[model samples]
Target: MRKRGRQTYTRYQTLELEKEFHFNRYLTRRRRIEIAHALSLTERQIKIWFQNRRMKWKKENKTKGEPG
Candidate 1:
């Protein structure tokens, strides 16, 4: 059975992924698979997680595009 809805990661999982994010803004397929299994999450989830993280970081890092 598949559960459909918004899902969030645990504290430890979030911490681990955040640490990985600090290492690189992008995640390779190899690392994504590795993290997927290690975190017991789907590869898609890992991919999307990194994507959202990167977007958020970029917005905060330099949101000079929009007028203040």
Candidate 2:
């Protein structure tokens, strides 16, 4: 039903998400709540963004990391 088209995040908002995601791949409920309030977004959106980001990270490192 997304006749509204895809919703895109702003540059600064993307920065915030990236920074937080870099610090923690997974978020606690409290952290999610705090981020939701700070970013004027929902916990669901925050969680979804992290989920997507994790998948992207996985693909990027698929054949890279190895033990020395």
Best by TM-score: 1
Worst 10 residues of 2 by lDDT: 1-10
Residue lDDT tens for model 2, 1-68: 55554656767778999999889999988999998888888888788888999988887776666776
Q: TM-scores across all candidates?
A: 0.76, 0.76
- After superposing candidate 1, which stretches have Cα over 4 Å from the reference? 1-7, 64-68
CA RMSD of all predictions: 4.0, 4.9
In model 1, what is the error at residue 15, expressed in angstroms? Answer: 0.6
Off by over 4 Å in 2: 1-7, 64-68
Q: What is the lDDT of residue 33 in candidate 2?
A: 92
Per residue, candidate 1 scores C-alpha lDDT tens digits across 1-68 of 87765667777888889999999899888888888888888888778888999988888887647775
